[PDB]
């Protein structure tokens, strides 16, 4: 039953499962006519490429029935792969007059509670972005897409045959769609790195090998948990496209109480391992692993990277004028095993004040790095002057040698201590390549909200504070992005997806 037919040419490996079309009459209050959750393979041909734009076109092969909208001037909006039902639910019973504004309103992918995981959620936590972006084995990917702007207006003519609509003779419009998530990818020059001392460390002279970093893994966190259904422009040059959390600029205290109102951390538990002797997270491929034809299984999942929801703030040229902070910006967390040479330990071969012998450092065990930069086998050593310790000195405990590094997804400018800004925008790929790991990282991750910040326990953080009270924190959520002295050498590439 149809007063007329219409169709939609769509423009952009991606699998398109579903298509939703919304015909919005112009001019004032009115009735939207929608055809939601159509089976893509029933209504469209397979994607093909155009020489000019070198982009994909999705050509209709079946007509869309029109009834209420016949004779009206409409604009057409499109959602592809609405697989969490979010667009359908947001747009239901929306008047034609309100539809354009509603199409740029917010959808919630993870609740505030869901934005934090625990150990029981690993190794495959539900993430905000994962709910609208799925990898189908190693074959292809199903990703939600929306149009940035609707079709040019057109008048739906009555009595147009399905054949003429499909052929584009009458009642055909054109829409461009873009993916609702961004992709993070990480690679590494080598799977191991040699660390040189830059000063005397125990018996290790400056310039000599201090340690080896092995078993490098990664996770991604602090993308958003909500998003504008389709991209929303800001009002100033410093932030082209705004996100629901753009206005949030944390302080040391408001980070813990308010960060989950905007950001997802469930992904920190991806590929988590409950054995603390083992490094948690996803493997990092070498550049060589991409050239490999026919990969295994868990290497395949690592190569294709991870999804996250957009996250932008007002950009600036310094700490004062940039609203990007460590507590509101998307980050890659790199985890690795740091194995120091036993000779690096200033307490080696010495005797404690209680006349017991200082034990030799055992590879893979905890070690402690004092405020003075020296290495100790225990807290007893750290504070005992007879073994090179210092009374009242604090130290960082590296739990079974676990070290942590941050990489920001879209550093600008580059390269070391001037990347003040890091916008993450949908339908882009952020490729972080590790060229080297240059020194000792951090022993825990303070960029995770702690529901009771007065104590070090935090079940929502796989890398909680292991240190005694009064120990300086490695970093703070209210800090700006750039590192005064780089822990990692990286090159970040951003390209259209
Ligand atoms: Ca706590």
Numbering used by the authors: 32 to 43, 70 to 554
Paste lines from the article:
In order to investigate the importance of the C-terminus in terms of folding and solubility an additional construct was designed and crystallized, pMfa1Δ9, where instead the N-terminal extension was present but the final nine residues at the C-terminus were removed. pMfa1Δ9 folds into two domains, the N- and C-domain which together form an elongated structure of approximate dimensions 100 × 45 × 40 Å. The C-domain (residues 237–554) also consists of two sheets, one mixed and one anti-parallel. In pMfa1Δ9 the β1-strand is anchored by the side chains of Met37, Met39, Leu41 and Met43. Further, in Mfa1 the N-terminal part of the β1-strand is shielded by a short helix that forms a lid over the sheet. In Mfa1, Trp554 is inserted into a hydrophobic cavity between the N- and C-terminal domains. Arg236 is in turn firmly positioned by hydrogen bonds to Asp71 located at the end of the Nmature region. Mfa1, the shaft protein, possesses an extended C-terminus that, in the crystal structure of the mature protein, partly reaches into the void formed by the missing β1-strand. This C-terminal region, however, had to be removed in order to obtain a precursor form of Mfa1 in which the N-terminal extension is intact.
P. gingivalis displays two forms of fimbriae on its surface, FimA and Mfa1, both of which are crucial for attachment to other bacteria in the oral biofilm and to the host cells. In the work presented herein we have determined the crystal structures of the shaft protein Mfa1, in both mature and precursor forms, the anchor protein Mfa2 and a truncated precursor form of the tip protein, Mfa3. The resulting mature protein thereby has an empty position in the first β-sheet that a β-strand donated from another fimbrial protein presumably fills in order to polymerize the individual proteins into a polymeric fimbria.
